[PDB]
Amino acid sequence: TLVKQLSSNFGAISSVLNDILSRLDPPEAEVQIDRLITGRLQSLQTYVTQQLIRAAEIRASANLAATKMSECVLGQSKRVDFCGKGYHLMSFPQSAPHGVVFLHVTYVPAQEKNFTTAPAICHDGKAHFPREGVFVSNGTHWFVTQRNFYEPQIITTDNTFVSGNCDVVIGIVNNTVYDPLQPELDS
Amino acid sequence: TQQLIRAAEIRASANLAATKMSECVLGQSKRVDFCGKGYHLMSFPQSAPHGVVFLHVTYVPAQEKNFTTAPAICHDGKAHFPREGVFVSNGTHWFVTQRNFYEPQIITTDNTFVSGNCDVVIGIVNNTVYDPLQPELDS
Amino acid sequence: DAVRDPQTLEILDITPCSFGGVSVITPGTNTSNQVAVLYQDVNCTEVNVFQTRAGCLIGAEHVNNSYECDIPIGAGICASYQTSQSIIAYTMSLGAENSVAYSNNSIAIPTNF
Amino acid sequence: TISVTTEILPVSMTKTSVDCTMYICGDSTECSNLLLQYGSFCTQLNRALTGIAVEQDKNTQEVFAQVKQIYKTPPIKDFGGFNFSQILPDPSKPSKRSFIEDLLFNKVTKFNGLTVLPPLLTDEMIAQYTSALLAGTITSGWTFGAGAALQIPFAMQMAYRFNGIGVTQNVLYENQKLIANQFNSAIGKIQDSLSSTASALGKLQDVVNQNAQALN
Ligand SMILES: *[C@@H]1O[C@H](CO)[C@@H](O[C@@H]2O[C@H](CO)[C@@H](O)[C@H](O)[C@H]2NC(C)=O)[C@H](O)[C@H]1NC(C)=O
Ligand SMILES: *[C@@H]1O[C@H](CO)[C@@H](O[C@@H]2O[C@H](CO)[C@@H](O)[C@H](O)[C@H]2NC(C)=O)[C@H](O)[C@H]1NC(C)=O
Ligand SMILES: *[C@@H]1O[C@H](CO)[C@@H](O[C@@H]2O[C@H](CO)[C@@H](O)[C@H](O)[C@H]2NC(C)=O)[C@H](O)[C@H]1NC(C)=O
Ligand SMILES: *[C@@H]1O[C@H](CO)[C@@H](O[C@@H]2O[C@H](CO)[C@@H](O)[C@H](O)[C@H]2NC(C)=O)[C@H](O)[C@H]1NC(C)=O
Ligand SMILES: *[C@@H]1O[C@H](CO)[C@@H](O[C@@H]2O[C@H](CO)[C@@H](O)[C@H](O)[C@H]2NC(C)=O)[C@H](O)[C@H]1NC(C)=O
Ligand SMILES: *[C@@H]1O[C@H](CO)[C@@H](O[C@@H]2O[C@H](CO)[C@@H](O)[C@H](O)[C@H]2NC(C)=O)[C@H](O)[C@H]1NC(C)=O
Ligand SMILES: *[C@@H]1O[C@H](CO)[C@@H](O)[C@H](O)[C@H]1NC(C)=O
Ligand SMILES: *[C@@H]1O[C@H](CO)[C@@H](O)[C@H](O)[C@H]1NC(C)=O
Ligand SMILES: *[C@@H]1O[C@H](CO)[C@@H](O)[C@H](O)[C@H]1NC(C)=O
Ligand SMILES: *[C@@H]1O[C@H](CO)[C@@H](O)[C@H](O)[C@H]1NC(C)=O
Ligand SMILES: *[C@@H]1O[C@H](CO)[C@@H](O)[C@H](O)[C@H]1NC(C)=O
Ligand SMILES: *[C@@H]1O[C@H](CO)[C@@H](O)[C@H](O)[C@H]1NC(C)=O
Ligand SMILES: *[C@@H]1O[C@H](CO)[C@@H](O)[C@H](O)[C@H]1NC(C)=O
């Protein structure tokens, strides 16, 4: 765009500076030249302003790029969708013309089953809650599992903790809680 | 020229908006004051003319009491530290509680762990640590 | 804005004559030479014709089926080149509809990843 | 205490567009011919404005179209005491907006070749996105964001969210009713604030005003 503008007359007798100078005396050539100077000066100013604004956008992008590198390649991120969709594991950077490319490796839960649940389990009037995980039921038996992959386990005093009683918790169910100490002392 | 510059400001705002949505509506945030003042629980978005509105729900601790504390407790020369929470005292008895909400419990070997001894820790206090195994074997 | 007729003293409003931008909606010429034309912000009066909030769209066939947006026209209308092939116009889909089975005592737990 | 707070952000601005030639030399051949002598001074303005107009729709898309599927709430609102009725959509309206969305829409308020282009997504479509987001949030927690929406009871969702801030989950179970009551009341206050405080929407009203002034 900038280049082509040179070919405009901006109302002078010619866009070609030498053609004005080779045909007019100074008192007349000056007038014609002023018309070209005005046009050309204006043209540069336009170009420069655009470049400044565009440069601003690039710098913002550069700052974001730098930030992913730090909190994503050098680390592991719990900011959601910051390092691709899924739960982030790790990332590898590769260079490219005028930028950077980021390969994110994530973890995506894949196949799933419908189970019945409860907030707490009653034992001897005590309310037992899971230390980690969820009380789940297969329809006949209660297990405790982690929240992200189905690993069912027997409900025991080493899986749960006790707080308060049966009369408070809404949706509390009855089951039994095994004590792993009992058979060690029993035998 | 004015429109270009103004447009730039809007785009920055749009990027921030998009970022709250992702790390706040579609999850929970431990970035402080990013999703309103308090500890963030969850957020709900509502639309509006030329923008978005975010209702943040947060948890704010509300009423409080002055208790006496210690870094560690001596038992049989052993230094016991809390696995989670704080040794607190009501003036006569020592309990262990969670940090964000007063919920006192008896100090036991299932609440604390042992490391080193009484001669190192500054401000260590004397108490007793109950062993829940003892009465199972005692009976 | 308005003038008094110098011969007969009545007041006449002067409204400048209808005008508007013209857009041409085209799949790349590497595929087809056929096009659809949108007359911006006018009625299908002054100008296979579909009146939209964007203006008067001529040359595109109006279709009932929604799809993912291809060439956007405006106010929820997009166009595409489809089947034998011609340019069509439709209200864009937002995506697939999916009710989630919520219950007070049921959880879904993934078994693989 | 459980508290509920309002954060407001602009997303977009009006897509104006200007005919550089018509503005300068309207319907004059003599003027037009003189204008030509400045080269591309005219067309490059048309281009710049176009750039802006396009990004306006991009902005909107990045914020709202975050969910791949349009989820919708169950017919039974059994969410363990928590009332969602002022934020979920109203079936009776010609545009299915929530009660509080309606309050927001009621607070925010030529022939020289100067025209205005419409946005790509309509108010109705934005409302459907919000709705999907909210249906997701309520019935599947954060799962819908990672991948598939896995359902869970509302109360259990909250128990995790309590563990996230370092408060033991028994607290939520034992204080279920008080927490639900605090929630419900906090939302009530949001209505009262929005319905009465004009200044609430200042950040959005300002954008409108700046653009209007520029054209005048
Ligand atoms: C719920 O879980 C239990 C434990 O895995 C299942 O019961 C077992 O079933 C097998 C037969 O496939 C027997 O060999 C075991 O002796 C059973 N154990 C007990 C404790 O009874 C039960 O079938 C499961 N229910 C369903 C429908 O999956
Ligand atoms: C869970 O088990 C307990 C028994 O351990 C049930 O408690 C009974 O509740 C009813 C209703 O108040 C009383 O009439 C009984 O006297 C209680 N029984 C005992 C032995 O105390 C409780 O209802 C059970 N829940 C379910 C749904 O099975
Ligand atoms: C510190 O905590 C203990 C335990 O709760 C308090 O001692 C109990 O006081 C009540 C009377 O209010 C008695 O019924 C219990 O038998 C006491 N237990 C023991 C271990 O002695 C004690 O009063 C508390 N101190 C203060 C000032 O709050
Ligand atoms: C905590 O209890 C121990 C006793 O178990 C105290 O140890 C005593 O320290 C002094 C000063 O060196 C000695 O003279 C005693 O002989 C120690 N006693 C025993 C039995 O070894 C300790 O000082 C106590 N702290 C406080 C402030 O009560
Ligand atoms: C989890 O998913 C993978 C599929 O991604 C399953 O792995 C396949 O296993 C069968 C053998 O049973 C092979 O024929 C395929 O080639 C496997 N695919 C891959 C990519 O490894 C796997 O069975 C599933 N496992 C669980 C835990 O259910
Ligand atoms: C959720 O809360 C709203 C109030 O904000 C309830 O709607 C009201 O219901 C009563 C009848 O019980 C009417 O008199 C009011 O006019 C209603 N107000 C509004 C704003 O609609 C709603 O029913 C509550 N839901 C539940 C199940 O508690
Ligand atoms: C759970 O139950 C519903 C019953 O309508 C069924 O449609 C759905 O596929 C089930 N989900 C899974 C993940 O098995
Ligand atoms: C779950 O919902 C059913 C009604 O469909 C009801 O019978 C039962 O009491 C409810 N349980 C809880 C925990 O709310
Ligand atoms: C703790 O003690 C000081 C004594 O000056 C008192 O002013 C203050 O109110 C107490 N704090 C609480 C939270 O009770
Ligand atoms: C706490 O401060 C007092 C002085 O006011 C002092 O007697 C005591 O030794 C101090 N304890 C610790 C743990 O520094
Ligand atoms: C474009 O057309 C040429 C034929 O001139 C062909 O070689 C090429 O594959 C085409 N490309 C696309 C992307 O349609
Ligand atoms: C087009 O003209 C008809 C009258 O023939 C009118 O009913 C209609 O509203 C007009 N549409 C627009 C958008 O100008
Ligand atoms: C769509 O189908 C309806 C009948 O339900 C018909 O009236 C209408 O003309 C059709 N529209 C298009 C775009 O084909």
Short mmCIF file of C-alpha atoms in Angstrom, two decimals, chain A residues 60-186:
data_model
loop_
_atom_site.label_atom_id
_atom_site.label_comp_id
_atom_site.label_asym_id
_atom_site.label_seq_id
_atom_site.Cartn_x
_atom_site.Cartn_y
_atom_site.Cartn_z
CA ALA A 60 0.15 -9.26 24.11
CA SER A 61 0.34 -12.59 22.30
CA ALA A 62 4.08 -12.85 23.13
CA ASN A 63 3.30 -12.34 26.83
CA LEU A 64 0.70 -15.08 26.78
CA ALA A 65 3.13 -17.41 24.99
CA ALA A 66 5.77 -16.73 27.62
CA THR A 67 3.23 -17.45 30.34
CA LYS A 68 2.19 -20.85 28.95
CA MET A 69 5.86 -21.84 28.69
CA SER A 70 6.39 -21.11 32.40
CA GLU A 71 3.11 -22.49 33.88
CA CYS A 72 2.64 -25.55 31.60
CA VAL A 73 5.97 -26.77 30.11
CA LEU A 74 8.02 -26.09 33.26
CA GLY A 75 5.13 -27.18 35.54
CA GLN A 76 1.69 -28.94 35.68
CA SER A 77 -1.42 -26.68 35.55
CA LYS A 78 -4.68 -26.79 37.53
CA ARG A 79 -5.97 -23.76 35.73
CA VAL A 80 -8.83 -25.22 33.64
CA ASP A 81 -8.49 -25.39 29.83
CA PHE A 82 -5.41 -23.21 30.14
CA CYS A 83 -3.23 -26.08 28.75
CA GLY A 84 -5.79 -27.84 26.44
CA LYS A 85 -9.06 -29.65 27.17
CA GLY A 86 -8.96 -32.54 29.72
CA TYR A 87 -6.92 -32.82 32.91
CA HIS A 88 -3.36 -31.56 32.08
CA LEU A 89 -0.45 -33.93 32.47
CA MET A 90 2.46 -32.25 30.57
CA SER A 91 3.39 -30.12 27.46
CA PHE A 92 6.20 -29.99 24.78
CA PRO A 93 7.09 -26.76 22.81
CA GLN A 94 8.21 -26.71 19.14
CA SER A 95 9.38 -23.66 17.23
CA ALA A 96 7.81 -22.23 14.05
CA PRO A 97 8.14 -19.19 11.79
CA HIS A 98 7.36 -16.08 13.82
CA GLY A 99 5.81 -18.09 16.68
CA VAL A 100 5.69 -21.13 18.95
CA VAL A 101 3.56 -24.35 18.91
CA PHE A 102 2.53 -26.26 22.08
CA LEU A 103 1.66 -30.01 22.13
CA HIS A 104 -0.47 -30.54 25.25
CA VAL A 105 -0.87 -34.14 26.64
CA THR A 106 -4.05 -34.47 28.82
CA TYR A 107 -6.14 -37.22 30.51
CA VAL A 108 -9.81 -37.77 29.46
CA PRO A 109 -12.21 -40.20 31.37
CA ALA A 110 -13.58 -42.53 28.83
CA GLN A 111 -16.28 -45.14 29.68
CA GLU A 112 -18.84 -45.00 32.52
CA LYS A 113 -21.45 -46.86 34.65
CA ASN A 114 -24.54 -45.75 36.63
CA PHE A 115 -24.20 -46.56 40.39
CA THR A 116 -26.28 -45.84 43.45
CA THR A 117 -24.79 -43.63 46.14
CA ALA A 118 -25.10 -42.19 49.70
CA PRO A 119 -23.52 -39.27 51.67
CA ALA A 120 -22.91 -41.38 54.75
CA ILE A 121 -23.27 -44.83 56.24
CA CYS A 122 -24.73 -45.74 59.66
CA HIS A 123 -23.05 -48.42 61.71
CA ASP A 124 -23.64 -48.46 65.45
CA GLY A 125 -25.58 -45.18 65.35
CA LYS A 126 -22.41 -43.46 64.21
CA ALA A 127 -22.25 -41.66 60.90
CA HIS A 128 -19.26 -42.76 58.80
CA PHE A 129 -18.01 -40.59 55.97
CA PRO A 130 -15.35 -41.52 53.33
CA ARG A 131 -11.93 -40.04 53.89
CA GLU A 132 -11.48 -39.94 50.12
CA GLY A 133 -13.84 -41.20 47.50
CA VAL A 134 -17.57 -41.99 47.37
CA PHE A 135 -19.81 -44.64 48.90
CA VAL A 136 -21.18 -46.52 45.89
CA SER A 137 -23.46 -49.49 45.48
CA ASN A 138 -23.71 -52.16 42.82
CA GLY A 139 -27.33 -52.82 43.87
CA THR A 140 -26.53 -55.29 46.66
CA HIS A 141 -23.28 -54.23 48.35
CA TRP A 142 -21.70 -50.98 49.39
CA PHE A 143 -18.10 -50.12 48.40
CA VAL A 144 -15.93 -47.04 48.60
CA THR A 145 -14.16 -45.89 45.38
CA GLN A 146 -11.95 -42.99 44.14
CA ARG A 147 -13.82 -40.30 42.16
CA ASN A 148 -12.13 -40.60 38.78
CA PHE A 149 -11.70 -44.30 38.06
CA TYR A 150 -13.72 -47.22 39.35
CA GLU A 151 -11.63 -48.98 42.03
CA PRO A 152 -14.20 -50.49 44.49
CA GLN A 153 -13.06 -51.40 47.96
CA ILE A 154 -14.53 -52.84 51.19
CA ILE A 155 -15.85 -50.23 53.59
CA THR A 156 -13.66 -50.22 56.69
CA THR A 157 -12.57 -47.96 59.52
CA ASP A 158 -9.41 -47.18 57.56
CA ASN A 159 -11.47 -45.82 54.67
CA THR A 160 -13.92 -43.72 56.67
CA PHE A 161 -14.05 -41.40 59.65
CA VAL A 162 -16.74 -40.86 62.22
CA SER A 163 -18.55 -37.67 63.06
CA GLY A 164 -21.87 -37.22 64.81
CA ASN A 165 -24.75 -39.65 64.33
CA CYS A 166 -27.58 -41.08 62.23
CA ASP A 167 -30.23 -38.45 63.07
CA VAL A 168 -28.68 -35.57 61.20
CA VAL A 169 -27.58 -36.69 57.74
CA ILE A 170 -30.20 -36.59 54.99
CA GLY A 171 -30.15 -39.74 52.89
CA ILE A 172 -27.97 -41.71 55.30
CA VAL A 173 -28.11 -45.46 54.64
CA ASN A 174 -27.54 -48.53 56.79
CA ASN A 175 -24.62 -50.90 56.16
CA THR A 176 -21.75 -52.47 58.05
CA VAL A 177 -18.26 -51.10 58.54
CA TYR A 178 -15.49 -53.61 58.88
CA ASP A 179 -12.81 -53.14 61.50
CA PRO A 180 -9.43 -54.55 60.25
CA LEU A 181 -8.13 -54.58 63.81
CA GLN A 182 -10.84 -56.96 65.04
CA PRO A 183 -9.51 -60.19 63.33
CA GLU A 184 -5.94 -59.39 64.44
CA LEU A 185 -7.12 -59.34 68.05
CA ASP A 186 -9.76 -62.03 67.42
#
